[PDB]
Amino acid sequence: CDNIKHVPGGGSVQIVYKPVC
């Protein structure tokens, strides 16, 4: 993952389970 502008909002849940990348 390159140049990712991750801007979570209010009450946002992100789960990344066993990535390889």
Partner 1 sequence: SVQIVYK
Ligand X SMILES: *Cc1cccc(C*)c1
Number of C-beta neighbours around residue 12 at 10 A:
8
What is the pattern of x (binds a copy of itself, CB under 8 A) and - over residues 1-21? xxxxxxxxxxxxxxxxxxxxx
The one-letter amino acid code at 13 reads V
Is 15 a binding residue for ligand X by CB under 6 A? The answer is no
1: Cβ contacts below 8 Å, ≥ 6 apart: 21
Query: Binders of partner 1 among 1-21, rule CB under 8 A?
Result: 2-3, 11, 13, 15, 17
Least distance between ligand X and beta carbon 3 (Å) = 10
C-alpha 12, offset from chain centre: 10
Which residues would be at the binding site for a copy of itself (CB under 8 A)? Answer: 1-21
